[PDB]
Design an enzyme around this catalytic site. Structure first.
Site, PDB file in Angstrom:
ATOM      1  N   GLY A   1      71.090  30.322   4.265  1.00 41.04           N
ATOM      2  CA  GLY A   1      72.127  29.000   4.848  1.00 41.04           C
ATOM      3  C   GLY A   1      73.528  29.828   5.311  1.00 41.04           C
TER       4      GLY A   1
ATOM      5  N   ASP B   1      69.501  39.469  -6.575  1.00 39.01           N
ATOM      6  CA  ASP B   1      71.229  39.878  -6.052  1.00 39.01           C
ATOM      7  C   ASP B   1      72.601  40.377  -6.333  1.00 39.01           C
ATOM      8  OD1 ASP B   1      71.917  40.037  -3.244  1.00 39.01           O
ATOM      9  OD2 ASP B   1      72.430  38.309  -2.843  1.00 39.01           O
TER      10      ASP B   1
END
Ligand SMILES: CCN(CC)C(=O)[C@H]1CCCN(c2cc(-c3c(N)nn4cccnc34)ncn2)C1
Length: 284
Positions: A18, A130
């Site tokens: 995003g 992550d």
């Protein structure tokens, strides 16, 4: 409580996942509204939107001092995730700005906090996939938070790992060996990533000493594409590790190398690591 489209005022771009924007939620129209952070998809297609949806359910269910606060959702089917705005920005940039002004006891405050956020995240059987200082944010001098969960996966009922069958973007320089050869992601491979984050902290995110710079040197800068993956697997299988950071005390470097164990069973737990780090802090 609801967030109306029309009252989200754009203030600034913040980054790409995003995309992340700084906005004022100003339903009163006098610019006294709260500044917040908005995550919106860039290419919202049925597969990716279901992902963003799952991600929002993940964040909403997470309540901890070191995880960024979920605030709400904004509808129009197209989603904007609303989060607290953490005013000191990205940890990566904050460490670069206040270079050596941040001493070792402060970096350990940050280590401890990241660690606690991960431990807690483990109690719900989530796997970050992550962990990296550009996904950590700063609220104030005394407080950092895990600020993104775009790649987090939920453990299946009966397994302790997750297989990612067709990978998208892959921060391979933070990846455990088994993740590289097999796409197996588990709490233990999040621990490996934590070791790399600890490395980042103690290099003060100096870009010439970053993990991608350092592994590339070790395998040769002439490596490209899929060849990097191949050679990195080999390098790690043979105990090629990131160097000790310059000025890094013995016992913190010790922690990193325990995190970078090829044998998954033998990596420490986030529970032990939080105790360990707090022990060190008190000793200093
Ligand atoms: C981790 C967010 N993210 C998605 C994977 C990024 O890509 C960052 C890396 C690059 C820098 N960038 C930002 C984010 C913010 C910020 C913030 N200040 N509060 N906040 C509350 C939730 C989310 N992000 C923020 N501030 C500065 N830079 C986005």
């Amino acid at each position: 409580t609801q967030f109306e489209e029309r009252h989200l005022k754009f203030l600034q771009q913040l980054g790409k996942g995003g995309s992340v924007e700084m906005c004022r939620y100003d339903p009163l129209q006098d610019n006294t509204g709260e500044v917040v952070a908005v995550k919106k998809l860039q290419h919202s297609t049925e597969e990716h939107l279901r992902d963003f949806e799952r991600e929002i359910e993940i964040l909403k269910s997470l309540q901890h001092d070191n995880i960024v606060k979920y605030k709400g959702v904004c509808y129009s089917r197209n989603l904007k995730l609303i989060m607290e705005y953490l005013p000191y920005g990205s940890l990566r940039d904050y460490l670069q700005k206040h270079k050596e002004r941040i001493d070792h006891i402060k970096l350990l405050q940050y280590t401890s906090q990241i660690c606690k956020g991960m431990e807690y995240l483990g109690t719900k059987r989530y796997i970050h996939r992550d962990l990296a200082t550009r996904n950590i944010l700063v609220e104030n001098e005394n407080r950092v938070k895990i600020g993104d969960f775009g790649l987090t996966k939920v453990l299946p009922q009966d397994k302790e790992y997750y297989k990612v069958k067709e990978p998208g973007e892959s921060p391979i320089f933070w990846y455990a060996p088994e993740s590289l050869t097999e796409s197996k992601f588990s709490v233990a491979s999040d621990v490996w990533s934590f070791g790399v984050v600890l490395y980042e902290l103690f290099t003060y995110i100096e870009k010439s000493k970053s993990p991608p710079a350092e592994f590339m040197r070790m395998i040769g800068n002439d490596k490209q594409g899929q060849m990097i993956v191949f050679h990195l697997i080999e390098l790690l299988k043979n105990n090629g590790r990131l160097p000790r950071p310059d000025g890094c005390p013995d016992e913190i470097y010790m922690i990193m190398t325990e995190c970078w164990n090829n044998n998954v069973n033998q990596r420490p737990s986030f529970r032990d690591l939080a105790l360990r780090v707090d022990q060190i802090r008190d000793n200093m």
